[PDB]
Amino acid sequence: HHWGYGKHNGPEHWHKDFPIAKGERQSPVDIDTHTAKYDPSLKPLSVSYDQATSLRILNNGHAFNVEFDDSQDKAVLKGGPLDGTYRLIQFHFHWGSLDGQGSEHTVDKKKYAAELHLVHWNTKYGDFGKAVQQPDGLAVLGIFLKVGSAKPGLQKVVDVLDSIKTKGKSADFTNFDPRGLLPESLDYWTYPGSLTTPPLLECVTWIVLKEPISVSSEQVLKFRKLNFNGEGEPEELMVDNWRPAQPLKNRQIKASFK
C-alpha cells in the first residue's frame, strides 16, 4: 500500500506515513499576487545551462525524470534569493487529466495544465542526499505550462515517452538542452517550502516563474499516455499527479518584480 495519487493512497493520506505533510512549510501553495511583497533587494536569477549533460529519462512510477550529470558545476543556478551555487540534477513535470488542472502551484487560484520542476542542490553539502536534510539544501525552479502553440524544445521529450511507458523503465537521453524549456522573462516569486512528493522534506527554496510556456494539446496528450503501473500489471494512466495547495501559515511570498 505505497503512496500515490489514487482514492486510497493519494495526498490526503500521505500524513499517515509522512507526518511532515502537516508541517509548517509545505508545498505547493496558492500565490496571491496582491499580497506578495515586492523585494527590491532580490537579485536577478543566473541560469547557466550551456554545458548541461543529460543522461537518462526514467519512469519512476509517479512522474518521469530527465536526469543530468551533477558531478561537476556544468548546469548551475545562482543569484535570485540564493546564496551559493546549486547544481541541476533532474527535471520532471506534474500534469492533469484535463487541460484545466495539473499544476501544483496556483496563481490567484488559477490552475495551469502542467508544471515543470527543475531540481537543483546546494553544492556546499556535497551530494543530493545530504542536501535534502538541510533547510537551504534545494532550489526548485517551477515553470507553468498552458495549452496553446507547441513548444519545439519539448518535442524530444515527448517523442521518447513511448519507450518508458511503465514504471521502472529507463532510456538513454543524451544531448538534451534544458534552455529550450525556459520562458522569455525570468521574473519570479519565491518562498520557503518543501518537496511536493514524499518524503515531503522542508528543504526547498521555491522559485516560481511568472511567465508560463505554451505547449500544444498534442504535446500534453502524450504525457497522459504514461502508466503509473509496471509492465504486466493492470493499466492505470499517469494523470493528476499533482498535490493540492497547502496552507501558507507564517510565510511571506516575495516577488522580484512590481
Residue 92 annotated in ligand binding: yes
Residues 6+ apart with CB under 8 A from 177: 49, 52, 153
25 touching Zn ion, by CB under 5 A: no
Restricting to residues 54-93, name those near Zn ion by CB under 5 A.
Answer: none
Question: How many Å apart are CA 89 and CA 68, to the nearest integer?
Answer: 5
**Does the active-site annotation cover 1?**
no
Q: Which of 25, 62, 117, 167 binds Zn ion (CB under 5 A)?
A: 117
Give me the catalytic one of 15, 62, 105, 120: 62
Query: Per DSSP, which regions of the chain are E strands?
Result: 30-31, 37-38, 45-48, 54-59, 64-68, 76-79, 86-95, 106-107, 114-122, 138-147, 170-172, 188-193, 204-209, 213-215, 254-255
Query: Closer to Zn ion at the Cβ: 39 or 101?
Result: 101
Residue 8 annotated in ligand binding: no
Radius of gyration of the chain (CA): 17
Residue 196 annotated in ligand binding: yes
- Angstrom CA distances, 236 to 53, 102, 113, 167, 188, stand at 32, 17, 20, 11, 35
Query: Closer to Zn ion at the Cβ: 18 or 124?
Result: 18
- The minimum distance between CB 117 and Zn ion, in angstroms, equals 4
User: Which residue number is nearest to Zn ion in terms of Cβ?
Assistant: 117
105 touching Zn ion, by CB under 5 A: no
Single out the segment in contact with Zn ion by CB under 5 A; choices: 9-17, 40-48, 115-123, 158-166.
115-123
Query: Residues marked as binding for substrate?
Result: 196-197
Residues binding Zn ion (CB under 5 A): 117
Q: Which residues are part of the catalytic machinery? A: 62
Query: Residues marked as binding for Zn(2+)?
Result: 92, 94, 117
